[PDB]
Design a protein around this ligand. Structure first.
Ligand code: 0EK
Length: 330
């Protein structure tokens, strides 16, 4: 079996991408944020405290003939950004882009933090990290990808994120029409439960490639590209008028600028992020100042190849027994 689904940015900034998913019988369509940095599938539901739901479409398990209560099971999760949610757990049929899994754990939110309440476009998350991070207890539940692997034509799923445009998530096949050249695979460490890999180095604009190991994780659920302080410092040094701003919380610069491109190694291959991808947006509508798409990882504790990096590539999440990450230009 295979699935193919369109993923669309939630706004003009590509802050995040939502992908419709069908849950229950008959099917209830919710727009979820596919998150390779976590492993919970959770949704806004009939069970979420009313004052906390805010324009989102909710999942009503009592209207699904195929839902069953996982009795005893609860969950609770917090994200890097400080947001959180908790509740209990159903199994139900879940479909993405025509790929159907039965007995998928669907985590139903009883409460949600203010961030998700204010996010009208996101009805919940679909986690695509390794199942070891799942927060359901007392027994952890498999991700949608893990449950799917038995029936997939190939145990993989590709992320094809658009620059200010829709993209695709594919399950179980690689669309050779989607990228240029060849896919370069690199080893993944599952020690911390992430899609964790090591970049072979970097270049800024048209200058020299520096071989230096950058350990980071591929996270579709993080907007920006967070690299070590001295790499980020090297990038913004090539932009006049760029400066670090305490008040905004990162490197800012004139919207006027043409930004240099940024290159990062994957084994012997090179992926080039066009400069315009790194120009995130004005810090406020009508400002001369724009927020940089590359920022320091120092405060986060881990390098993150987030959406600004990933949408410059075709990315293959190879979830064979011994996982690997594939990158191609597109
Ligand atoms: C550690 C990273 C790589 C993985 N991760 C991050 C998620 O992918 C998570 C997915 C989001 C959550 C919010 C809603 C949309 C989906 N991403 C994030 O939390 C990042 C973090 C970040 C970095 N810098 C500034 N913010 N959020 C973002 O990148 C948001 C996305 C967004 C889009 C639209 C609207 C709102 C928010 N974008 C954003 O802020 O953009 C601007 C900076 C321009 C404002 C996790 O949350 N993982 C959990 C797994 C939980 C498993 C529990 N068993 C975790 O480790 N949580 C840790 C937190 C942590 C880890 C490591 C170090 C420190 C803290 C914990 O236990 O608390």
């Amino acid at each position: 079996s295979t699935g193919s689904a369109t993923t669309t940015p939630i706004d003009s900034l590509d802050d995040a991408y939502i992908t419709p998913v069908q849950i229950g019988t008959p099917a209830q369509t919710l727009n979820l944020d596919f998150d390779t940095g976590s492993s919970d599938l959770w949704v806004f539901s009939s069970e979420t405290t009313a004052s906390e739901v805010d324009g989102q479409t909710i999942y009503t398990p009592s209207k699904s003939t195929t839902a069953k209560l996982l009795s005893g099971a609860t969950w609770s999760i917090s994200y890097g950004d400080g947001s959180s949610s908790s509740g209990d757990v159903y199994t139900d049929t879940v479909s993405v882009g025509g790929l159907t899994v039965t007995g998928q754990a669907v985590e139903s939110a009883k409460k949600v933090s203010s961030s998700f309440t204010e996010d009208s476009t996101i009805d919940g998350l679909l986690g695509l990290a390794f199942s070891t991070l799942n927060t359901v207890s007392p027994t952890q539940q498999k991700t949608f990808f893990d449950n799917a692997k038995a029936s997939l034509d190939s145990p993989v799923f590709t992320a094809d994120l658009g620059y200010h445009a829709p993209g695709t998530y594919n399950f179980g096949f690689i669309d050779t029409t989607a990228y240029t050249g060849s896919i370069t695979y690199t080893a993944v460490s599952t020690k911390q439960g992430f899609w964790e890999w090591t970049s072979t180095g970097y270049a800024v604009g048209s200058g020299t490639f520096k071989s230096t190991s950058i350990d980071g994780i591929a996270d579709t659920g993080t907007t920006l590209l967070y690299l070590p302080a001295t790499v980020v410092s090297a990038y913004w040094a090539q932009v006049s008028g760029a400066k670090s701003s305490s008040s905004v919380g990162g490197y800012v610069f004139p919207c006027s600028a043409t930004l240099p491109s940024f290159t990062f190694g994957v084994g012997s291959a090179r992926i080039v992020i066009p400069g315009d991808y790194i120009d995130f947006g004005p810090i406020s509508t009508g400002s001369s100042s724009c927020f940089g798409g590359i920022q320091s990882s120092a405060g986060i504790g881990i390098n993150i190849f987030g959406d600004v990096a990933l949408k410059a590539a075709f990315v293959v999440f190879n979830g064979a027994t011994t996982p690997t990450l594939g990158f191609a230009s597109k």
